[PDB]
């Protein structure tokens, strides 16, 4: 039952490694959440550019039709 002890120490090692993995995987999640946010800000700016250009096309069409 040094091998009870040995299996114990094997399991601790494994716990340590899994705990580092969980810690890292929760870092990757946090930064995916902020890049998604950033990409969504890019969508919103583009929607804003489309609507400005639609306004400019409408203005030109009023003139064009006089």
Residues within the interface to ligand [N+] (CB under 6 A)? 50-51, 54
Q: Does 15 bind a second copy (CB under 8 A)?
A: yes
> Which of a second copy, ligand [N+], none does residue 66 bind (CB under 5 to 8 Å by kind)?
none
**First CA to last CA across the chain, in angstroms?**
98
**Smallest gap from residue 60 Cβ to a second copy (A):** 4
**Smallest gap from residue 47 Cβ to ligand [N+] (A):** 7
CA atoms within 13 A on the CB side of 56: 6
Token look-up 């583009």 returns 46
């Amino acid at each position: 039952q040094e091998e009870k002890q040995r299996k114990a120490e094997e399991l601790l090692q494994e716990l340590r490694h899994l705990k580092i993995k969980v810690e890292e995987l929760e870092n990757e999640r946090n930064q995916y959440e902020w890049k998604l946010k950033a990409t969504k800000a890019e969508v919103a700016q583009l929607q804003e550019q489309v609507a400005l250009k639609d306004a400019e096309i409408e203005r030109l069409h009023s003139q064009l039709s006089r």
